[PDB]
Every structure is written in C-alpha cells, then in structure tokens.
Amino acid sequence: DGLRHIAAGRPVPGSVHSVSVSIPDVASVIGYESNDAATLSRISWGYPRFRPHPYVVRVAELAAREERGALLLTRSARAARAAAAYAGLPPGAARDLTLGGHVLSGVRLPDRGPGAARARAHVMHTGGHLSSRQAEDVLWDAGLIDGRQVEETADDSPARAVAQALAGAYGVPGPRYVALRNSGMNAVAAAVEAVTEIQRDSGRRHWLQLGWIFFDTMHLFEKKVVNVGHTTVPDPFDLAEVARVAAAHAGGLAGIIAEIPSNPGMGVPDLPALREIADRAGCALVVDATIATPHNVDVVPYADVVCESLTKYATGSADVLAGAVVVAPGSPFAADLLTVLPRYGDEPYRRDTARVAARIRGYAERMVRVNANALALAECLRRHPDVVRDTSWALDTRSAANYRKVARDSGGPGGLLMVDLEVPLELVYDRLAVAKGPSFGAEFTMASPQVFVAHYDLLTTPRGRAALRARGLHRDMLRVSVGTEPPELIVETFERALRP
Numbered sequence: 161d162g163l164r165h166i167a168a169g170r171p172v173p174g175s176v177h178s179v180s181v182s183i184p185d186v187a188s189v190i191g192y193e194s195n196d197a198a199t200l201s202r203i204s205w206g207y208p209r210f211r212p213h214p215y216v217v218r219v220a221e222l223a224a225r226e227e228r229g230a231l232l233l234t235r236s237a238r239a240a241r242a243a244a245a246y247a248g249l250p251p252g253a254a255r256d257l258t259l260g261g262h263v264l265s266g267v268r269l270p271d272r273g274p275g276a277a278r279a280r281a282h283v284m285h286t287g288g289h290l291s292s293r294q295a296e297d298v299l300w301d302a303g304l305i306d307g308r309q310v311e312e313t314a315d316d317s318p319a320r321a322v323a324q325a326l327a328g329a330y331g332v333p334g335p336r337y338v339a340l341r342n343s344g345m346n347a348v349a350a351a352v353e354a355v356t357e358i359q360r361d362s363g364r365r366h367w368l369q370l371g372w373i374f375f376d377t378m379h380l381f382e383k384k385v386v387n388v389g390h391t392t393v394p395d396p397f398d399l400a401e402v403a404r405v406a407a408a409h410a411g412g413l414a415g416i417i418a419e420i421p422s423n424p425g426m427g428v429p430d431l432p433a434l435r436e437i438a439d440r441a442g443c444a445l446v447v448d449a450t451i452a453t454p455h456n457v458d459v460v461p462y463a464d465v466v467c468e469s470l471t472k473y474a475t476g477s478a479d480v481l482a483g484a485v486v487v488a489p490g491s492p493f494a495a496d497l498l499t500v501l502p503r504y505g506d507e508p509y510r511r512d513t514a515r516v517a518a519r520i521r522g523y524a525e526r527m528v529r530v531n532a533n534a535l536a537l538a539e540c541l542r543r544h545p546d547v548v549r550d551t552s553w554a555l556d557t558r559s560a561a562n563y564r565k566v567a568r569d570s571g572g573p574g575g576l577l578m579v580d581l582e583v584p585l586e587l588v589y590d591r592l593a594v595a596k597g598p599s600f601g602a603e604f605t606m607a608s609p610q611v612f613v614a615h616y617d618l619l620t621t622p623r624g625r626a627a628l629r630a631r632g633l634h635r636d637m638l639r640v641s642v643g644t645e646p647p648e649l650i651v652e653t654f655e656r657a658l659r660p
C-alpha cells in the first residue's frame with residue numbers, strides 16, 4: 161500500500177499504535193514544528209516520544225482524578241524517580257498510581273518553573289515513556305474503550321525470541337549478551353549510563369561524541385541527562401582530531417559514542433581505527449548501528465557495546481518502539497556491563513515485545529529488498545543534477561571506504577538516503593507520493609523533512625542557519641527511507657516528483 165498520497169493528519173500506517181503521521185507538505189511541516197494550533201488540530205498525531213499518544217493522555221487524566229489538579233506518565237517507577245531527580249523536583253513528585261487494576265508510575269509536574277520541561281525532556285531523551293499498548297490495556301481492562309487494535313504478535317516468550325534473533329544477527333553467543341529496552345533511546349541511555357558507572361572508579365567521566373549524531377543522543381550529553389562531561393568532534397572522518405581530543409583527556413575518557421551511518425548526515429566513521437583509539441584511551445566504544453542494521457555491517461568485533469532502535473527496520477511496521485543493547489563478548493568491559501546493565505533503563509512492556517517478536521522474523525529478507533531499492537534510488541537521484549545537489553549515504557564518496565571496512569559480504573547500504581536539494585523543499589516534497597512524516601524503517605517508503613524535525617529552531621534565523629550550515633545541513637533536505645516496494649515503482653515515484 162506504499163507509494164501513494166496519504167491525507168494530512170492520518171496516522172501512518174494507521175494502527176492505533178502508529179508511530180508516524182502524514183505531514184505531506186512543507187506548509188504543514190512548518191505549522192507542526194512551530195506548534196501552530198490550527199495545524200495541530202488537523203495533525204494531532206505524532207511520534208510517541210514527542211507527542212503523547214491519546215490513550216496515554218487519557219490514562220494520565222483519569223489516574224490524576226484519583227489532589228486532582230499535570231501528570232507525566234513513565235514506563236517505570238525507576239524512570240519516574242530519575243526524571244524527578246533530573247528535573248530538580250522533590251522525590252515525592254514521583255508517584256505510583258492505580259487505574260483499571262494496573263499500577264502506573266509518573267511524575268507530578270509543577271505549574272510554574274522549569275521543572276515540568278526538564279522532567280518531560282528526561283522522559284523524552286531517554287525513551288522512558290508509557291507505551292500506547294500499555295495504556296490501551298489499562299483503558300480496556302477498566303472498561304473505558306470498546307476494543308483493542310488487532311495486530312499480529314508472537315506472544316510465546318517474546319523477549320527471548322527477540323534477543324535470540326538479535327544474537328544471531330549480531331553474531332554474539334546468545335541472548336545473555338542482548339538486553340531489550342523501552343526504545344532505541346532507552347537502549348542508548350542505558351549503555352551510556354552503564355559504561356559511565358563502570359568507568360567512574362578509575363576517574364574516567366568524560367565522553368567523546370563522534371560527529372553530529374541523532375539529536376536525542378546529543379541532548380543526553382548537552383542537557384546532562386547523563387551527568388558526564390563531553391566533547392563533540394564535529395568531523396566523524398577526522399581521526400587525527402579524535403586522537404588529539406583523546407590525548408587531551410588521557411586517562412579520563414569513559415567512552416566514545418558513534419553512529420553508523422549517522423542520523424541524518426549519513427557519515428560512516430572508521431570503526432577499526434576508533435577501536436584502536438579506544439584501546440589506547442582505555443575507554444569503551446559504543447556504536448549505534450540502527451541505520452546500517454546488523455544484516456549489513458558486522459560491528460561487534462570493533463565495538464564494546466552496540467545499540468539499535470528496533471522501532472525502525474528491525475520491525476518494518478512503524479508501530480512499536482523498542483531498543484537493544486548488545487554487549488561484545490570479547491570486550492574487557494563485558495563482565496561488568498552484564499552486571500551493571502540491569503540497573504539502567506526498562507524492558508519494553510511485554511505486548512510491545514510480542515509485536516517486535518512477530519515483526520523481527522522478516523528482518524533479513526526485508527533488508528535484501530530495502531538494500532536493492534536504496535541502490536536503485538541512489539542512481540536515480542544522481543541522474544537529476546538540476547534538482548538534487550548531493551545525496552549522502554553509506555556508499556557515497558565520503559563514506560564508502562569506511563563502510564566497506566565493516567560491511568558484510570552480502571551487505572548493502574541500508575535504506576536511508578539524505579537528499580540535498582537545489583530547489584525549495586516544497587517543489588519536491590509536496591508532490592512526492594510517499595508517506596511523509598516522522599520516523600523511518602517501514603516496509604513502505606517514507607520521507608522526512610528531517611532538518612525541520614531535528615532543528616526547526618535553528619532554521620528560523622540567520623544565525624541558526626549558519627550553525628546548521630557548519631554541520632552540512634540546510635532547510636531544503638529530504639531524508640528518504642526506502643521500503644520493500646518494487647524498485648522501478650520507487651524510482652518512477654521519485655522521477656515524477658523531481659521533474660518540473
């Protein structure tokens with residue numbers, strides 16, 4: 161059902177648990193990111209870490225009714241306590257409530273002050289939110305909704321099933337080396353917190369962020385959600401600069417965090433070189449391989465910890481959030497990581513895990529088709545030099561050599577292409593017949609106006625645009641996430657949107 165125009169504001173793919181929404185023209189994107197009230201009434205849905213799901217809102221309203229006067233619901237009491245502490249709220253702000261036979265955890269937020277915004281930021285950047293499947297079960301058990309979303313799940317020991325599938329994909333001995341977390345960000349935060357804890361005793365409290373990477377991961381460090389010092393090395397290819405910054409912090413580096421490729425710039429770092437730097441520094445190397453997938457790259461040999469957002473291609477359904485932390489068995493940190501990791505983050509609600517278990521069965525087959533489609537579309541984009549200025553991806557001239565160092569023999573580039581346009585985004589995006597909106601990694605082709613999603617605030621002024629320019633980004637860019645449709649149909653769809 162891909163490659164069609166979807167009416168503005170419709171949840172995408174359509175399930176109650178949809179993580180995306182149709183935002184099909186730039187005017188609507190601007191209205192959505194600027195919180196224009198008319199746009200938000202027409203397009204009220206959103207990615208569940210960014211716009212609270214209606215069932216979560218309703219559960220929060222009803223749980224608060226039993227002082228009635230804002231309540232931020234979380235995945236766990238642990239997550240609520242962490243958000244309250246980060247926000248500077250009293251410990252009593254974190255509370256356990258009840259509704260429909262269920263225990264709920266959340267933080268009571270103050271009306272005034274910055275505490276409300278900080279608590280929401282903590283839950284958001286760490287992926288510690290209550291899921292829509294859990295809220296749906298609360299409401300259904302309480303008799304407050306008629307029915308539940310019908311969907312395929314694999315309910316027999318789903319966490320073991322998912323962990324075993326990922327152990328095979330990453331090439332680790334078994335599920336003991338794979339921890340499931342509430343979302344990709346919950347996995348990243350758990351990995352960073354675990355490494356930080358293990359490294360604290362030796363005086364290592366500083367992190368190096370390699371390049372510009374996914375915005376929530378950057379916020380974890382910039383906003384001190386993880387209480388560490390950090391330095392960003394803006395050029396992920398500049399290994400001499402990485403070594404210079406590491407030398408400045410010699411004996412003091414807890415870890416280096418990197419992405420392969422990076423979101424959304426698509427830069428591929430040199431993981432074998434980073435491993436040697438990390439070894440010399442005595443620090444851990446944490447790699448987020450979401451965009452490549454373990455079916456395309458073999459990065460466990462070079463990383464101490466690998467993280468993945470299973471929300472994306474691992475499921476291909478755009479309807480469940482989950483994350484994975486994979487511990488490298490040969491890492492010197494491996495034993496301490498397996499001891500310490502259970503203290504950080506939260507496993508997903510089991511019904512979410514059961515959805516992952518059903519959807520992950522087709523991961524390898526999905527990536528075969530996705531890879532072929534990305535290759536076909538990349539050649540198409542090169543053939544439109546009057547409209548497409550640049551395309552950044554794993555096999556471009558910047559990244560191909562580094563990608564080849566870790567690519568599997570059958571491995572392809574994954575599904576993402578970051579398209580830099582010579583024309584205003586409107587002239588391509590508005591007419592493009594794909595699902596347009598947040599997230600990526602579905603079996604239908606998607607596109608995101610990703611600089612608006614990540615950095616709307618910086619797009620709004622000359623100095624903000626100069627800052628984005630320094631990162632290689634500007635307004636008129638489209639992040640394409642290819643699905644599994646026939647390649648000729650994807651190519652034709654883009655040809656029609658690229659021509660005048």
Ligand SMILES: Cc1ncc(COP(=O)(O)O)c(/C=C/C(=O)C(=O)O)c1O
Binds near residue numbers: 344450471598
């Ligand atoms: C590399 C990488 N690592 C971690 C995450 C967080 O996953 P979740 O916590 O499951 O949301 C993302 C998510 C990216 C988007 O949501 C998007 O860019 O549309 C990512 O690209």
Ligand SMILES: [Mg+2]
Binds near residue numbers: 550580632
């Ligand atoms: Mg460029």
